[PDB]
C-alpha cells in the first residue's frame, strides 16, 4: 500500500476540501473511503484516551463499509483545470458515483451507480471497460477487489 | 549518492532497469541456481514502467457515447430502433461494447 494516508474530518453533513501546491511526479492515483470518527484512533500519540471503542478498526484493518455513501467527486488542478477533462467522462466536469434523479440515463447494471464510475472502476481494478464488460478471472477478483463486494 | 551520482528513480529502481540487468551476473546466476530452495529473487525490485507516447491521444475525445435513435417504430409485438453510430475520424471500437440500454 504505497500511499500517503490523509484522513480529513467530516462534519455530519455535506461536502469537503483539498491540498496545496506540489510536484505530483510519479503519482499513481487516489483511493477514497469514509470511516467513522469513533472507530479511527489517534496515530502519533502512544495512547489514545478518546478511543473507547473495541471491535474492527477499518483504517488499519481493511474492513470498509461506508464507501457506498459517496455521491460524486471533483478533482481540480491549479483551481483552473478539471482532472477528467478532454471530455473523457459522461459527465466531463467531475466523477459521479451515485445519481438519484435518473431523469435521463447514465445508470449501470441494475443499481444506483452510474456508468462512467462503473467504467472507471472496471479499468482501475481489472482493465476491462474498453473491450466490453465481462467477469474478471478468479485470480484477479479478490477480497479487496470491486466486483467481489458489489451488491446491487 | 541518491540525487548526485544517479537520478532518484534509477537509484531506487522505480524506472531504471530490471533486476536481472542491474544485479551482478554472479548474483543473478546464484539466484537462478538457488531459486528452488532459497529464492533470492524476492528481495530485488523491477521498475515496471508504462509507455509514455503513441498509446493515448490526449486530444479531447470521449470514452462513452450515448446514441439516441434516429427513428423508432413499435408494433405491439416488437420495438424496433434505428441508430447510426459515427466512428470518429481516427478512433476504432470493438462491438464487444455498444450494449443496448
Amino acid at each position: 500500500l504505497s500511499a500517503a494516508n490523509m484522513l480529513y474530518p467530516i462534519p455530519p453533513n455535506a461536502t469537503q476540501l483539498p491540498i496545496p501546491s506540489r510536484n505530483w511526479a510519479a503519482f499513481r492515483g487516489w483511493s477514497l473511503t469514509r470511516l467513522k470518527q469513533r472507530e479511527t484512533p489517534a496515530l502519533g500519540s502512544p495512547f489514545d484516551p478518546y478511543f473507547t471503542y473495541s471491535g474492527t478498526i477499518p483504517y488499519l484493518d481493511g474492513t470498509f463499509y461506508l464507501s457506498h455513501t459517496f455521491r460524486k467527486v471533483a478533482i481540480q488542478f491549479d483551481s483552473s483545470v478539471t482532472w477528467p477533462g478532454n471530455d473523457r467522462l459522461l459527465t466531463p466536469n467531475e466523477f459521479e458515483i451515485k445519481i438519484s434523479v435518473d431523469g435521463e440515463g447514465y445508470n449501470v447494471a441494475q443499481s444506483n451507480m452510474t456508468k462512467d464510475w462503473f467504467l472507471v472502476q472496471m479499468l482501475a481494478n481489472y482493465n476491462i471497460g474498453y473491450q466490453g464488460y465481462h467477469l474478471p478471472p478468479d485470480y484477479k477478483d479478490r477480497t479487496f477487489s470491486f466486483l467481489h463486494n458489489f451488491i446491487p | 549518492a541518491t540525487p548526485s551520482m544517479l537520478p532518484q528513480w534509477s537509484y531506487m529502481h522505480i524506472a531504471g532497469q530490471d533486476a536481472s540487468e542491474y544485479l551482478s551476473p554472479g548474483l543473478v546466476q546464484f539466484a537462478q541456481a538457488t531459486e528452488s530452495y532459497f529464492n533470492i529473487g524476492n528481495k530485488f525490485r523491477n521498475p515496471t514502467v508504462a509507455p509514455t507516447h503513441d498509446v493515448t491521444t490526449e486530444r479531447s475525445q470521449r470514452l462513452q457515447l450515448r446514441f439516441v435513435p434516429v427513428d423508432r417504430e413499435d408494433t405491439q409485438y416488437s420495438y424496433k430502433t434505428r441508430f447510426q453510430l459515427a466512428v470518429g475520424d481516427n478512433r476504432v471500437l470493438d462491438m464487444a461494447s455498444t450494449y443496448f440500454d
Partner: peptide
C-alpha cells in the same frame, strides 16, 4: 529475478 507487485 525480481518482484514488482503493489496496490495498483
Amino acid at each position: 529475478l525480481g518482484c514488482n507487485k503493489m496496490y495498483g
